[PDB]
Amino acid sequence: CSPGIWQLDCTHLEGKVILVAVHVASGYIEAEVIPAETGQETAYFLLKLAGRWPVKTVHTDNGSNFTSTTVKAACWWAGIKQEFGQGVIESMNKELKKIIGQVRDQAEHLKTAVQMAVFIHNKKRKYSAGERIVDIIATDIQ
Amino acid sequence: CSPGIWQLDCTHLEGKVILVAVHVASGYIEAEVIPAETGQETAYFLLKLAGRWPVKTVHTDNGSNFTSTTVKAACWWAGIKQEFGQGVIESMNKELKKIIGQVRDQAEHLKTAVQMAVFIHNKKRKYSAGERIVDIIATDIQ
């Protein structure tokens, strides 16, 4: 519920790798299709994420994905630390896969379908996650 | 000054292409290094952008970059239209190139340097652009 906590995980679909970042307090999602699970891709994603949102701590369900020199250097430079302290994260990753399946025919490539699904998830109201994160961040500014 | 207007342009550095999106009302920036200037890369970028921020209209200094079937299909699906209505956009693209030059040694690859520069630009206060965009968006929600 703290506004700087994000959850990062990878999932697999059609032989490809989808990196999914969830803003825990709001359920707002950022995702990316990457060619392979590598430290360089995780580091680049963290650096991008932290330049766009105030990323204070990152949690993950696979701690070993954060052990590479490259990843630690990105967290070091951006000032990110590892979160050492549930149902939100489960529901967001599972709803994402459902939406991807729904819009899969609308897109030539998986990566396009993934961004359509992120779009749909963040705008769908039940307020939307996208409205909740800006409200959470803007109120925290005060 | 309307909260849904973005400016998109490409610039070149070290033989590579940097796609820069500026939120006009705040000066908040999103950037990406792409391998080549193609409609597919512009479309993918727009789709990503619109899933993260409320993108209503897009302006550009090279109108021909928005003519491809691929790009129009992305704007169609995301509900984006073309803005047909100054000093902000100039200052943001020029300050970005300056910061890249400053942090260039800190990074192995240009794309890393670009994300460091985006990070620095959005956080630098003179409020920051990153604080201004969430304030602008959250107030507009009301």
Numbering used by the authors:
A (entry chain A), B (entry chain A): 56 to 140, 148 to 188, 194 to 209
How did the manuscript describe this experimental structure?
HIV-1 integrase (HIV-1 IN) plays a key role in virus integration without the need for any other co-factors. HIV-1 IN consists of three domains: N-terminus, catalytic core domain, and C-terminus.
Even though the unit cell volume of the non-cryogenic structure was greater (by approximately 3.35%) than that of the cryogenic structure due to the cryogenic cooling effect, we directly compared both structures, and found significant structural changes associated with protein functions and characteristics. However, this phenomenon is thought to be a combination of poor resolution and changes in the dynamics of the water molecules as a result of temperature, since several water molecules that cannot be seen in the cryogenic structure are clearly visible in the non-cryogenic structure. At ambient temperature, the number of water molecules making up the hydrogen bond network was reduced from 3 to 1, and the direction of the sidechains, such as Asp64, Glu92, and Asn120, also changed. At ambient temperatures, the non-cryogenic structure had a relatively wider catalytic cavity volume in the DDE triad compared to the cryogenic structure. The B-factor in the non-cryogenic structure of IN-CCD also shows good agreement for their dynamics properties in solution state analyzed by NMR, which is not seen in the cryogenic structure.
